[PDB]
Amino acid sequence: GSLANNIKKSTVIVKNATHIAICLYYKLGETPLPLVIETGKDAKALQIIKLAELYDIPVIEDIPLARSLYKNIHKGQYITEDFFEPVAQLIRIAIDL
Ligand code: PRO
């Protein structure tokens, strides 16, 4: 579960500037719900965002959602029902792209 490999397979990243980055992973047939596969604050959020760019993972800024995911959903956990709609919207955009 190395940082680069996690980002590489991620579906979408949601961010609050350089402070927080949340890497979400959803694949029908593999994940029953979107999974928080990687998270970072500060230097680590910066690392995530540069790797995202290198691997062409869509990065969407949403400050309240990035904040709330970071507070509530730890790396390696699925999202909770609170997040289903908002994260479903972010996944559809990533698919759009
Ligand atoms: O400090 C926080 O807000 C988050 C909670 C889970 C991991 N870090």
Radius of gyration from C-alpha coordinates of the chain? 12
**Method used to obtain the model:** X-ray
Contact 13, 61 (CB under 8 A): no
Nearest CA to ligand 1 atom 1: 71
Instruction: Select from 36, 37, 65, 74 the residue to mutate for testing ligand 1; criterion: most ligand atoms less than 8 Å from CB.
Output: 74
Distance of alpha carbon 37 from alpha carbon 10, whole angstroms: 8
Resolution as reported, in Å: 1.9
- The count of structural domains within the chain is 1
Residues of the domain holding 93 = 1-97
Distance of alpha carbon 97 from alpha carbon 80, whole angstroms: 25
Q: Taking Cα atoms as reference points, which of 97, 81, 55, 32 lies closest to residue 23?
A: 55
How big, in percent rounded to 5, are the helix, strand and coil portions of the chain? 45, 25, 30
CATH of the domain at 83: 3.40.1690.10
> From the CA of 41, how far away is ligand 1's center (Å)?
9
